[PDB]
Amino acid sequence: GSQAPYLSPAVPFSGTIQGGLQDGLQITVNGTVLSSSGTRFAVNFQTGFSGNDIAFHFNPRFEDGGYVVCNTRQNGSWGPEERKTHMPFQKGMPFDLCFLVQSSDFKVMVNGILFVQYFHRVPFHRVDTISVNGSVQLSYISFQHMYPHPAYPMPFITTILGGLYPSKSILLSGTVLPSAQSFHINLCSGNHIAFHLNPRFDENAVVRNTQIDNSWGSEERSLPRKMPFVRGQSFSVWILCEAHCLKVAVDGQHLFEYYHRLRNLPTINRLEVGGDIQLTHVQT
Numbered sequence: 001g002s003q004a005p006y007l008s009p010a011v012p013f014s015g016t017i018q019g020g021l022q023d024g025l026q027i028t029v030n031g032t033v034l035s036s037s038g039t040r041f042a043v044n045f046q047t048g049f050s051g052n053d054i055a056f057h058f059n060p061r062f063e064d065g066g067y068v069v070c071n072t073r074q075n076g077s078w079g080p081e082e083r084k085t086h087m088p089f090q091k092g093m094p095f096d097l098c099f100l101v102q103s104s105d106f107k108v109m110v111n112g113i114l115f116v117q118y119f120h121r122v123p124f125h126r127v128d129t130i131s132v133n134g135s136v137q138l139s140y141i142s143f144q145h146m147y148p149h150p151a152y153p154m155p156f157i158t159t160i161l162g163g164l165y166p167s168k169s170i171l172l173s174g175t176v177l178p179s180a181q182s183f184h185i186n187l188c189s190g191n192h193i194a195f196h197l198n199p200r201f202d203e204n205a206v207v208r209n210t211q212i213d214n215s216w217g218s219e220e221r222s223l224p225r226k227m228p229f230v231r232g233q234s235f236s237v238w239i240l241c242e243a244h245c246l247k248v249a250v251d252g253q254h255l256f257e258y259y260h261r262l263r264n265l266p267t268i269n270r271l272e273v274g275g276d277i278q279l280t281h282v283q284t
């Protein structure tokens with residue numbers, strides 16, 4: 001069983017990794033590097049919340065042409081720095097950063113490409129905390145016990161085992177096709193669509209509705225700001241189920257609430273994704 005994800009955690013952030021790091025554990029970080037608020041950010045796998053002991057410090061730096069520093073801190077002492085002289089991140093752009101823990105190292109992938117392989121210097125069992133600081137904003141941090149990035153056929157239909165309930169979250173990472181017209185995300189119950197999320201680029205709107213016995217209800221189109229999705233750009237979306245409504249955020253920014261119309265939450269046990277996007281991650 002994998003622990004629940006951290007949704008839109010505020011930076012600086014520090015959170016427990018339930019059960020500590022384990023061989024086969026994959027930690028996914030979806031966020032966006034700030035456009036004009038600093039020149040570096042870091043993701044740390046550490047022991048406790050002090051910072052004196054960081055088993056793995058992943059530090060992208062938008063300095064001197066861009067590079068990334070990897071190191072370990074033990075009892076306040078930094079070890080030999082391991083640097084990658086190329087920068088896979090971009091200011092103002094969302095990213096998919098995944099850490100795969102293995103017996104001898106951390107496999108670090110950025111937007112689907114293996115970027116760094118960091119051999120353990122400190123026993124990975126001693127890591128019980130993940131922290132994030134710097135010029136970055138977070139959408140979510142998820143956990144999954146293990147392909148790190150499998151191919152998702154479109155449309156993608158999958159079962160939400162156990163269905164919905166208060167505190168249940170659904171996560172999605174993908175990319176809007178450059179030529180995208182629209183795409184949708186449905187949470188279904190039998191022959192009904194409990195929740196329909198439909199971003200439309202041509203209409204420049206994000207439509208939400210419910211379909212009962214093939215009949216659509218009142219459309220909800222409210223948005224706190226401009227269209228959050230961009231053509232050709234990667235994105236992340238999380239849907240949090242509460243007793244009275246669903247809360248939806250895109251790239252870490254709350255977009256809206258959608259009060260339940262179909263109330264038997266456990267029956268909402270199917271997720272369907274279709275349209276003009278490519279999927280990267282899905283957690284149900």
Ligand SMILES: OC[C@H]1O[C@@H](O[C@H]2[C@H](O)[C@@H](O)[C@@H](O)O[C@@H]2CO)[C@H](O)[C@@H](O)[C@H]1O
Nearest residue numbers: 196198207208209210216217218219220
């Ligand atoms: O409410 C979601 C469904 O909308 C349908 O289109 C609506 C359209 O949004 C509205 O402006 C009006 O023209 O009525 C249409 C038909 O109901 C979509 O066709 C359907 O796929 C859902 O997205």
Ligand SMILES: OC[C@H]1O[C@@H](O[C@H]2[C@H](O)[C@@H](O)[C@H](O)O[C@@H]2CO)[C@H](O)[C@@H](O)[C@H]1O
Nearest residue numbers: 042057059069070071072078079080081
């Ligand atoms: O090594 C990780 C650690 O680096 C510190 O900065 C280093 C710097 O990278 C190096 O070139 C210089 O010789 O020493 C500095 C201090 O050790 C950062 O300050 C720290 O936050 C970590 O990123």
Ligand SMILES: [Zn+2]
Nearest residue numbers: 028096097098
């Ligand atoms: Zn990933």
